[PDB]
Ligand binder design. Structure first.
Ligand SMILES: [Cl-]
Ligand SMILES: [Cl-]
Lengths: 192, 189
């Protein structure tokens, strides 16, 4: 596990550069690295021309990583680069910084929740959702602990316990606790 | 034989990178050619042999000379134009310079660049390397002020020299120097 040093203002950028860098080499030989002082503490794997990532969980055996990029699909990485500077306009008018964009996907997606339940545009596919959370995460410098803990609990839950209804609802209260500190209640309230 | 693709990101540097790494596979087994819709710099773009080259459309002039924007281990030039689009460049005096001023400065405010154009082991920066940085910077500028479009088109057409003469250099220089004065709101002198 090479830890490599950041060469851009965004992790998404350093990741885009190595991804193309290592793309060829990766078809014959899996590469594997960390970024220095990654606030999200991800392990990155280049295998077979794809980039994968999972936040590191100590207790937990990881049997499941998440795709950051494929050859014809780098727009995830690129969009976190742009998004990191100017956030995101949703099609119904509004504007979200990359952190609120991620907080939204993590805490205000009932389709996502529903899919987590069921585990043990609007998507309902748990892995797709997480992958996209991962992509946002690579554009965010100094994330509030609730994005960090949020991404870790979701990525843990899916490393299967053949997870039970109990593990799901334990998770659904934890995320609510975090949705609670992340957003001021009185703001959730004016959003209906 | 020029496919046209439509801007997919706030910046051309961004779209360029998505396509570059998307077409890496085909470009070895085939050359590869295209254009961004409404590119203010009118670049024609070629992927060939795992690299991406560019040149500004001239075409009265036939182009012996094209310019490398990326290669598989060297995409940072383009990524940097994304960052510098939003936030510009931090100089050794703690000041912050925009991508436009940075392009301006490389094009108009650099005398090693000029002498090398006169001319057209090691040295500080070769002429083609200079113009490549200029092209790379260009892809990060949204609504480029005319002197930048002009300057880049000039210097580009110059370098397809056909053994261009002392006279042609001096034609270039006066114009660059005009464009300079307009760009900087120099009072003359
Ligand atoms: Cl950070
Ligand atoms: Cl434009």
């Amino acid at each position: 596990i090479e830890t490599i040093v950041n060469e851009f203002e965004t992790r998404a950028g350093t990741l885009l550069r190595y991804y193309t860098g290592l793309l060829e080499r990766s078809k014959v030989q899996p590469c594997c690295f960390k970024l220095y002082n990654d606030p999200f503490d991800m392990v990155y794997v280049m295998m077979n021309s794809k980039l994968f990532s999972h936040v590191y969980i100590k207790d937990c055996k990881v049997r499941q990583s998440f795709e950051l990029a494929s050859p014809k699909h780098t727009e995830g990485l690129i969009r976190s680069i742009e998004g990191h500077y100017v956030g995101y306009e949703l099609h119904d008018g509004k504007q979200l910084s990359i952190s609120d964009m991620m907080a939204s996907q993590l805490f205000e997606d009932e389709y996502f929740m529903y899919g987590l339940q069921t585990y043990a545009s609007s998507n309902t596919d748990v892995i797709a959702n997480i992958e996209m959370l991962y992509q946002l995460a690579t554009g965010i410098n100094e994330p509030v602990p609730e994005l960090v803990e949020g991404l870790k609990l979701v990525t843990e839950f899916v490393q299967d316990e053949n997870a039970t209804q109990e593990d799901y609802k334990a998770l659904e209260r934890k995320l609510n606790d975090l949705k609670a500190s992340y957003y001021s209640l009185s703001k959730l309230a004016a959003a209906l």
